[PDB]
Amino acid sequence: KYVQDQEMIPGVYWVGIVDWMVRIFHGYHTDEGSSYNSYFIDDECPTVIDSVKYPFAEEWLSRIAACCPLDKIKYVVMNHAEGDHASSLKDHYHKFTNATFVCTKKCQEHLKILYGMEKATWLIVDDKYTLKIGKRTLKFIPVPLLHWPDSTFTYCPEDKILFSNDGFGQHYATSRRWADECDVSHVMHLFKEYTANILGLFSAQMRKALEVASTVEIKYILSAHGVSWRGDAMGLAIAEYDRWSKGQHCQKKVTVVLDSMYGTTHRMALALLDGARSTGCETVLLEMTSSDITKVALHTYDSGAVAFASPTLNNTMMPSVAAALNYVRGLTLIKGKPAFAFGAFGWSNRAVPDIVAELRDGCKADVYDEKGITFKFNYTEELLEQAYNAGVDLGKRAIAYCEKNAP
Amino acid sequence: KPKYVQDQEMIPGVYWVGIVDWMVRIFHGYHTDEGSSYNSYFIDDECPTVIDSVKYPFAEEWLSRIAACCPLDKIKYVVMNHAEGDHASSLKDHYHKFTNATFVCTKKCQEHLKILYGMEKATWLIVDDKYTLKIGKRTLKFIPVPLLHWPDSTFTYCPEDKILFSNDGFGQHYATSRRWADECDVSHVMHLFKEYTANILGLFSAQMRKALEVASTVEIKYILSAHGVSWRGDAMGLAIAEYDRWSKGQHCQKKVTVVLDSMYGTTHRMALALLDGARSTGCETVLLEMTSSDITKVALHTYDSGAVAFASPTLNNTMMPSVAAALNYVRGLTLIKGKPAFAFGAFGWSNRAVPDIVAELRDGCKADVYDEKGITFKFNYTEELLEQAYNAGVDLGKRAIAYCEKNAP
Amino acid sequence: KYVQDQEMIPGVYWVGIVDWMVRIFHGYHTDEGSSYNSYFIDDECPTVIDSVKYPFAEEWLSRIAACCPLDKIKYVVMNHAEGDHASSLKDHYHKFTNATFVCTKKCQEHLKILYGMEKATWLIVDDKYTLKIGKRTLKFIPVPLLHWPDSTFTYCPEDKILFSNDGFGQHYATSRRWADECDVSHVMHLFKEYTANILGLFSAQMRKALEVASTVEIKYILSAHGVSWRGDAMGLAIAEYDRWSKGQHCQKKVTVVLDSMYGTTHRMALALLDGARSTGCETVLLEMTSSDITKVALHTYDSGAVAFASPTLNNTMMPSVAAALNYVRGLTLIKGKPAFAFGAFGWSNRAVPDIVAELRDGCKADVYDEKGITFKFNYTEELLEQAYNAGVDLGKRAIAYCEKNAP
Amino acid sequence: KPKYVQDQEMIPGVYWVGIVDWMVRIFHGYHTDEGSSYNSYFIDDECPTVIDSVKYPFAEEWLSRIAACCPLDKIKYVVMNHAEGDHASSLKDHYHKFTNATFVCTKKCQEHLKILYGMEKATWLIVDDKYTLKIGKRTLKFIPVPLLHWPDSTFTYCPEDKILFSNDGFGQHYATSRRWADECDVSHVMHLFKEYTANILGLFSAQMRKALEVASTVEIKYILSAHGVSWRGDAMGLAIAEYDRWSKGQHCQKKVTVVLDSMYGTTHRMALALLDGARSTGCETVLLEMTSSDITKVALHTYDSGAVAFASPTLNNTMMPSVAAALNYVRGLTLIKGKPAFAFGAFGWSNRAVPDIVAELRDGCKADVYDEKGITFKFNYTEELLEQAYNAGVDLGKRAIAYCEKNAP
């Protein structure tokens, strides 16, 4: 015995791993690590839900074996073929001598392409298939493009458990298995960060999945990342997804994202920020030299209005701002939102036009003022006052936006 | 005068005129992952008064905020609680701008301000713990808190408005547009409040006991700190309660933290087995590996652990440099003094890291090093070794629970 | 005495500062720090050439004072108004009680806007003005947009010194003042990095400035960054600028720039790399998770061909690759060069089309194969062979490009 | 079989089948700013032979390169010089793929390979310094180099082709498509060759003396290393000459390095004055501040300095944790043993960092701590203090020059 068995509810065990050390994960800055949660269901047909990424294969296998001999597992349910939940299967899928791998057709296709699994036995399920595992039954809820074509939730009607896989997840390494055992506001913070960064462009798919969830009874949501959900905290998590899925998740908040070389665009950004704050909005300033794209997604996600700024560098915007806009564009996080642009230049104003074009045509933001504010080389008190006034207007627009899109 | 700052009246006649340091990430070696702020306050009274200054890069912003409230030549008093650069260094170049002001501080603070910053032509008013400064409707009192955390450290108290200007006290390195804890997630503010305590104040519990004793003697409705958000109502009660428990050594949790570094991951795998053992007792368990952590987080977690473990493979006849740094830091801050502490690690040919860690835990940190052998092994772990690690963790977890029971609030 | 006087040639003293600690400088990764070199000319009219960035004002003033009382300086020549050479003047320009600030009209304009300097005495020079300073005279060579509109070189005909300011510079912190006292190949390395990152888009302006330099005699080039140049090493530095200015600076070299989340685009990149290597080219692989835009500029600068790769992330390329392309585009470093693109996708191939468009229309590279190589989810031996073959073709194209554009 | 690797014949019948690790940036705590490679070699002879393996993540690439030269079932010998994971860990999962191979190594290497990696069904041939392995036209000899840098470390020598397969020996953490030093900037390769020596081998000069003695007895035309580029001709002469000087303690330069950390920059400014003093003597001077440097660079520079200084302000009654790490690392590597060493630093109320640095330099590093007082000051420097620092630097520079003269090659 060198693992602790962790029964979370009667007959359902956490057999995942905590990734204490991960700091960059597919470009997400996981400042608090993550976990790859897998579950063991102690029933007539002993069942494993999901796997883990491949450096942790032996730890995963050890926790399963502590519950049930690997050769007595009957079913391994795979919700999603992504490596963080999957990749252990490439070299380890055989240790489940007598198991059937249970998944949808699209999941089975991706698993084979990724990891091979040439000798595996399959059971291909769908949204009408009911799988008897003894006392319990399992249903399968395809959630295509939430966030992959193969994404699935597994639902146990008897215990009222949703195995939501990436759904309801947070990149959060902890020894606690439930949200309510932590600071719930901290878990909700990471839950929103996960939503912004991974799910941002899939609000429509979320509406569909929440609609399905609303037709069944759920007392527990066991996610594949971070902590799991029950009772009141579970209510909060569901409500946040619900508002987000309807575009009702924004706050009276302005975020300014920028980079700067000699600090003048930064000083203007501070004056604009005070203007926005004067309207009663929360204001956040994110400078790419001290921030990252993961935080840009987090804050733009629930901002009522945004500003992006850069001085002109080599006839365009700074690369860090190009990265941030690419990321926000891909994730659709500012679509329809008031968006302002400003920046210094030395001889030819190019960054601001480029930012404006990207916000308007790329992000489909509400670029209400295409001129923005530009200045040659240095600010002055009058320019600071102009930035402040633009901030007042931006904060007013954020408040009006939130009212228009209110929950 | 063009308007480019928002006036921020926090309570009647008291304005925030500080700055938010959005970008700072390393601050005297503190990993300020969430930035900080240098809070300064303007009191609108018959003698217009400024409390504290800010770090020199932000001087013009600070002066701009003050001038929006009152012309600089009409400021009568600038009260300085602390001479450290983050609240003071703008005075070097800029103090002359307060044409008519007198700088008000204790003798120790004046000595330090002059050595650091010059202020050769400044007008001073030297105060002590018996001085009442009249500023109009309000008066101000001064509470020296020496070595909380500098010899010059002071609090300023206003009896009429029940305000404690606590300077570094009650601070958190937290950049936000919010001025009050209750406007934020209070649990998040408390997390950073604890990180600040662990990293800046850790060795000063006796001085905190003294300071809390004095504060207990007067009514406080507001604590306006010089870093991060300020305190009122219920949230203020929480902040005070944490300092009180910590000053008495009653701040610990049923929690085990393992701090380590590893080169090929075998010391890491043994750490995981130990952690599960500890978790089985009902303790929270945190693993901090120095390649993905930092000394600021080491201080945070060791602060409120009931027990700790430190681990390293042998590298060149000693422990890994990252673990030496973590131990230096923890020793200086006294965070694990008296606490159950365990050590383990791999070696190739000569076991040196674990003996060196044990000696440092026992003689440097003055931890409760109950097992001076620890667990060592050559090159690789086995299932038997993982089991031994797990069992050592169970015992460590039990010792953490015992330590907390003995020191309970 | 707490500074060492550093006479570099008779009557000419280094009075700059070494910035040992700087690691990020206007977005340039200065892994080896930098220096802001200023010079004191001991003549009848004691003269200072350039200033320094503003945290180092007192150290600069101290080294000058060690040579000559600050109130006995007659001239302060300013080549360039950028903060790294300038910004000390804002709060310190007055310490030169009896000095005249000598610069071109555009330099004077930028200095005032930046730093104020309201009480300063000016002498506005131009490309025909000769300034007597005693034994020596100074001439002024405007080098507009090398790299700023105000950029200037100062030339002393008697001593045959070119004070080239940013010209001939390298971000290199050392106690050595001359290239030949270091490892010259190391200095040339940083010299090329500086060229790629700061001067990349100004080859035309470099041809003009080298033409002017070719009309006068230069024994020493005293730069404002890093080490200075004489004799043989000086010949190397001049020759590299000359080739670069004519587009003759490329090597038989292929650089592949990419990011990857799960490593399949990375494995394909390795096979492509071996294909290019087989043709006799040097091959460099730069992965954005372990590289930076400064290194991307360095390597694309002298590559004969390039490849950019990314899997599809949220219907576009990864943000780090968007940043790299923005930067390379701004700097014009791959204009006209063979350029290939490839990458994995899960369901909709978008990164490769976006990379192709950016390379073709943005960078104006020679995108000879717009399809590139794309694959769903995972490589296979046949796909690796396809990547290898594309690499052979890319390396052949790099060699043909170098031959076409040969020195 | 699809073709997706280039065969890379380095010399007649000897092929590079290693991997270039383009992305590695931290390697067992070494800051590998330029990546590395794990070089393995295939010898085309009557008994097809592989020298060394690679780190497990790169196993399939390594096997692909080998298979392009020879089917895996036709490999007769796999020679293992060293059991460390970077050259060996692919064997854990993959060793069975060499169906017909015998693993050839010393007894110590076999013991370590089995403990690390299992290899339960492997066929072994245990060799020693008197064994000649016939592989066809060629024979192979084995040169144990214990503690250069592991107990199992070995070189393999081919007498017919005059090849030394030196494994970690002569290595550099350098990722490049070039296989030979002379195809690169040789000065750059030598820089990294020195960084490798300083960081990996620093404490093993005696073992290097032994190894060079043995190598001197045979003719070597090629040194094929397991990291970075390999050596031939003139460049090979340079590499050998550096190891020779270093093994004899003759590797130092007229060079002073100052290693420090600072919180508010006054210790930093004094460092600059000291550095100018040192520079005035004709020494090169390098300043390394831990917030912008790393222990790998500290090792690099202290390696070939004739004198050093270490500095820190007092933080919580001791030196800054970053400086404790740098000293731990330097102590373990023995890089400043016998070298003139100076200490200085600011303090606020109680001078603790400088005494702690002096004790560590003197008793831990066994440096020549000629002035145990150093320079300390409260809070801030003055022109007089800068002058004192400058003078201490002049003296340190003179002592560096003297140390180099005494130890000259």
Ligand SMILES: Cc1cc2nc3c(=O)[nH]c(=O)nc-3n(C[C@H](O)[C@H](O)[C@H](O)COP(=O)(O)O)c2cc1C
């Ligand atoms: C390396 C560098 C490149 C620049 N390239 C351009 C350019 O292409 N066009 C332009 O108008 N200004 C250019 N500038 C001028 C900047 O836009 C100008 O310095 C501005 O004031 C910087 O704003 P900031 O203080 O926010 O960094 C450049 C400046 C630097 C330092």
Ligand SMILES: Cc1cc2nc3c(=O)[nH]c(=O)nc-3n(C[C@H](O)[C@H](O)[C@H](O)COP(=O)(O)O)c2cc1C
């Ligand atoms: C560069 C390096 C230096 C080492 N130095 C020592 C040493 O001085 N003494 C020792 O007993 N083992 C030494 N070792 C062996 C390690 O302690 C051994 O590899 C251990 O198993 C590593 O533990 P880990 O897997 O947790 O990294 C060294 C290993 C490396 C990689």
Ligand SMILES: Cc1cc2nc3c(=O)[nH]c(=O)nc-3n(C[C@H](O)[C@H](O)[C@H](O)COP(=O)(O)O)c2cc1C
């Ligand atoms: C967070 C994430 C988002 C993705 N978004 C898309 C997408 O928008 N379109 C697509 O075709 N594939 C998408 N993919 C699939 C990747 O392109 C696919 O996993 C690919 O194989 C990764 O290549 P790599 O191994 O080089 O990282 C996404 C994958 C992840 C992990």
Ligand SMILES: Cc1cc2nc3c(=O)[nH]c(=O)nc-3n(C[C@H](O)[C@H](O)[C@H](O)COP(=O)(O)O)c2cc1C
């Ligand atoms: C957080 C912190 C902790 C300190 N702890 C001590 C201490 O334990 N003893 C002491 O004498 N000075 C202490 N000091 C004072 C510093 O040593 C003093 O500020 C010194 O001038 C800093 O040097 P520097 O400018 O090189 O950073 C401390 C300062 C700070 C900022």
